[PDB]
Amino acid sequence: DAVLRARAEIDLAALRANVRALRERAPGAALMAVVKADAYGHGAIPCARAAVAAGATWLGTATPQEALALRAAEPGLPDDVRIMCWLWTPGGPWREAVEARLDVSVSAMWAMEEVTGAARAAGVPARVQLKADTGLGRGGCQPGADWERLVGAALRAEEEGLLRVTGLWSHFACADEPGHPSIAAQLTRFREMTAYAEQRGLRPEVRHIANSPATLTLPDAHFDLVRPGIAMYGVSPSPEIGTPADFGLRPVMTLAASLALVKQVPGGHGVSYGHHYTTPGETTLGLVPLGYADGIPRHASSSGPVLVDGKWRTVAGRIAMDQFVVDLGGDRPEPGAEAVLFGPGDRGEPTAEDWAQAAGTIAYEIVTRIGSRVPRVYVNE
Amino acid sequence: RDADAVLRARAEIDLAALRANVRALRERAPGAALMAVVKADAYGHGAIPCARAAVAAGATWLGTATPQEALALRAAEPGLPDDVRIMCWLWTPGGPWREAVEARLDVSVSAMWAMEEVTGAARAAGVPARVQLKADTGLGRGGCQPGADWERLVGAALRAEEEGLLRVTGLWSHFACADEPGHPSIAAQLTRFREMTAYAEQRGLRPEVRHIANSPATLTLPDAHFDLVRPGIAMYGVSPSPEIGTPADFGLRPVMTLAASLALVKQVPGGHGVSYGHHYTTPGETTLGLVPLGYADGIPRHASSSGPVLVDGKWRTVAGRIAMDQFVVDLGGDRPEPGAEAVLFGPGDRGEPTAEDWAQAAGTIAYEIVTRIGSRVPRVYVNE
Numbered sequence A: 001d002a003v004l005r006a007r008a009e010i011d012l013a014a015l016r017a018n019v020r021a022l023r024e025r026a027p028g029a030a031l032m033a034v035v036k037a038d039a040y041g042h043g044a045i046p047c048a049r050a051a052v053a054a055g056a057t058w059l060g061t062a063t064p065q066e067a068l069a070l071r072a073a074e075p076g077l078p079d080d081v082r083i084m085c086w087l088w089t090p091g092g093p094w095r096e097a098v099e100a101r102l103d104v105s106v107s108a109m110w111a112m113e114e115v116t117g118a119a120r121a122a123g124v125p126a127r128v129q130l131k132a133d134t135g136l137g138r139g140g141c142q143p144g145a146d147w148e149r150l151v152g153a154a155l156r157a158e159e160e161g162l163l164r165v166t167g168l169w170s171h172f173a174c175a176d177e178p179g180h181p182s183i184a185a186q187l188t189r190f191r192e193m194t195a196y197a198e199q200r201g202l203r204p205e206v207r208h209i210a211n212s213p214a215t216l217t218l219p220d221a222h223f224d225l226v227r228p229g230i231a232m233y234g235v236s237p238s239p240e241i242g243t244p245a246d247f248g249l250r251p252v253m254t255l256a257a258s259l260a261l262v263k264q265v266p267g268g269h270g271v272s273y274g275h276h277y278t279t280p281g282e283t284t285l286g287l288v289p290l291g292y293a294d295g296i297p298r299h300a301s302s303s304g305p306v307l308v309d310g311k312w313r314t315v316a317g318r319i320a321m322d323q324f325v326v327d328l329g330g331d332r333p334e335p336g337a338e339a340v341l342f343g344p345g346d347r348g349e350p351t352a353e354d355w356a357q358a359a360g361t362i363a364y365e366i367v368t369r370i371g372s373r374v375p376r377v378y379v380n381e
Numbered sequence B: 001r002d003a004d005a006v007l008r009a010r011a012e013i014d015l016a017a018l019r020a021n022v023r024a025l026r027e028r029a030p031g032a033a034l035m036a037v038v039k040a041d042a043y044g045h046g047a048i049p050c051a052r053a054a055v056a057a058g059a060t061w062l063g064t065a066t067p068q069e070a071l072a073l074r075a076a077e078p079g080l081p082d083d084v085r086i087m088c089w090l091w092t093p094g095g096p097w098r099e100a101v102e103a104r105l106d107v108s109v110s111a112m113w114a115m116e117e118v119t120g121a122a123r124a125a126g127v128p129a130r131v132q133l134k135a136d137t138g139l140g141r142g143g144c145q146p147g148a149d150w151e152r153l154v155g156a157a158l159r160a161e162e163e164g165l166l167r168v169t170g171l172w173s174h175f176a177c178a179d180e181p182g183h184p185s186i187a188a189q190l191t192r193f194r195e196m197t198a199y200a201e202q203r204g205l206r207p208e209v210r211h212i213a214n215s216p217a218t219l220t221l222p223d224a225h226f227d228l229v230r231p232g233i234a235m236y237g238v239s240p241s242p243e244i245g246t247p248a249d250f251g252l253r254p255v256m257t258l259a260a261s262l263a264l265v266k267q268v269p270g271g272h273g274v275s276y277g278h279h280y281t282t283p284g285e286t287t288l289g290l291v292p293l294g295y296a297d298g299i300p301r302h303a304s305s306s307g308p309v310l311v312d313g314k315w316r317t318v319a320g321r322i323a324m325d326q327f328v329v330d331l332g333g334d335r336p337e338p339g340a341e342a343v344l345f346g347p348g349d350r351g352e353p354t355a356e357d358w359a360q361a362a363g364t365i366a367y368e369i370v371t372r373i374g375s376r377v378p379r380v381y382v383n384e
């Protein structure tokens, strides 16, 4: 019913194909299926099921709310599966997390005190992962005095039987630019900081630093576990890394819509807000009923590609809240016709990366921000 | 329980400001009814709550894009007044035209396929349709072109009225350049709206309302008001354009405040990079604040290195790239406690940035800033 306007087709078979492709590239490691941000706009639970089915033994989320929803899923995901969440703030539901058997990242002393406190109240121990700041400079614990202290506080919490440090981990800043100096720097600092913590008595199940581009291009970086997010959704972290086809990967999301309106307009007739496109001669206009409220970026005004009626069209002028227009040369498809904004590539459609370029951003943002008003349709469940 | 997800971040929706705005707007358009446009989840502010507030303060029409949005308004519990008019315009073939006619929605029709589908549905349902013909005055998006197409649509509508299947309750259009005051096209569209409406009345159509006015029109063009105004963005207290003015210039107060709690405050040496691609490196020794919102939450990635955030009493600006769930600010050397409030935007009166300030940092319009705040950011409603 709502699918008639537009839809995001989520091909869960492609997803499973990707997870397998990725388990091949990282043969000596477990794979985490990162399903944060509603599985990058693809649907958290469905994608998480598919990714376990195909060999993911860890799930990854940002917020603890996301991770708890995975654990509350009906039907249940395997209870034996590990679920990690990293984005915590003071007063967060640390108790509910320890009870639900989540792996929780800790990168700072306030969090260590809060998680330890919660393990006491709950009675059962915590699974904690220390985040090390290797150079990224976002979240993460800085080396030297802060790391010393956190490693130590973790060691005491292990003594007292309140938690076991199940991992040591970090994140790359520039892995998507292959052979950039910082990659090697962060990597040897990850080895120093991990070595230090093991040398002082911590015994983790897993070390991990690898995001998608790392996983694809740096076998040194794999360690016990990989976190290829975007690559699991079949999209390349960077055109410098390669196409999805280069790594045996197939895009999972196809974004399509039905033409609301096909109409003939004379020449010198403006199109959309600010009249930033006026028709060159007499022509036809197609109304695609998706706009920036649906996550069609407004930066892709005048540039965004759409396959309509067998040819690539491009957005004519500005993108509105709910709609945009394409110039159809003089072609006259029936209203209701399919307008495919992006997909895998094999039916002549543009890809998510093509929209990333039109909008001056990364493909990550294109898929993740597809609006909740666009219903998701799941195929090959 | 849900008082747990607010700790990371929240969008505070001040429904009293919204009611203040709907009144300010009814004042600017004294000879007209006001439609509260609550499309796109009330521009990211929450459709139903805002719709209630807007009715409370004098809106006698509600406006949506999709028929799904409008049907949800009609299904609201507790109910909105049954006497209130709800219009929806963004239709595609095979859409739920029957459910719309039954639910007593005003439906836009701008094309012959739709006229046939809506008429067909009125037959099946047995009760007549309320239809609004959309006229293409110059915008060139979804209306009916003048001349041969308008002639035909007006005529098909007239026949449908004869047969008792629908009554054309409105004739309407939309401005392309009203946000740029005195642009030539405004006057052009407006006189073509008068020609096309005159034509349809002259041929026997008798509408309840003519309307063309969006927010900027409503604020700057009393000629444009006609029977009804559709000020969307202005109702949420944000100015359609800095060229039109500030919200304060029109007695309007922004409804959404977007705030978050610092996840991390930490000291880093100089020459230490920040975020993806190392597009900010620290000038000397300094402090970094982690704000736990990213582009998945609708913090535009175009506002990398530029986005303003009030933290600890001073405006900070985004340090380098915005990630999926987080960004960093350079805090000089200040050391606020983690859990401290980071206000990204609001009304302006506590020293915060506004939605327009983010629009500029990201190279876009404020409309996009508020509308695309993610569903993973819980909304908190105050003064309901």
Ligand SMILES: *Cc1c(COP(=O)(O)O)cnc(C)c1O
Residues within 6 Å of the ligand: A034, A086, A171, A210, A211, A212, A213, A227, A228, A229, A230, A231, A237, B324
């Ligand atoms: C976002 C994220 C990932 C996956 O993202 P890619 O860049 O697609 O690999 C992995 N790990 C962490 C900690 C993240 O925050």
Ligand SMILES: *Cc1c(COP(=O)(O)O)cnc(C)c1O
Residues within 6 Å of the ligand: A321, B037, B063, B089, B174, B213, B214, B215, B216, B230, B231, B232, B233, B234, B240
């Ligand atoms: C978007 C929209 C509006 C509101 O425009 P503002 O500039 O936000 O006031 C009004 N009417 C229709 C038909 C719309 O699509």
Ligand SMILES: [Cl-]
Residues within 6 Å of the ligand: A132, A133, A134, A135, A136, A137, A138, A139, A140, A171
């Ligand atoms: Cl980090």
Ligand SMILES: [Cl-]
Residues within 6 Å of the ligand: B135, B136, B137, B138, B139, B140, B141, B142, B143, B144, B174
């Ligand atoms: Cl139009």
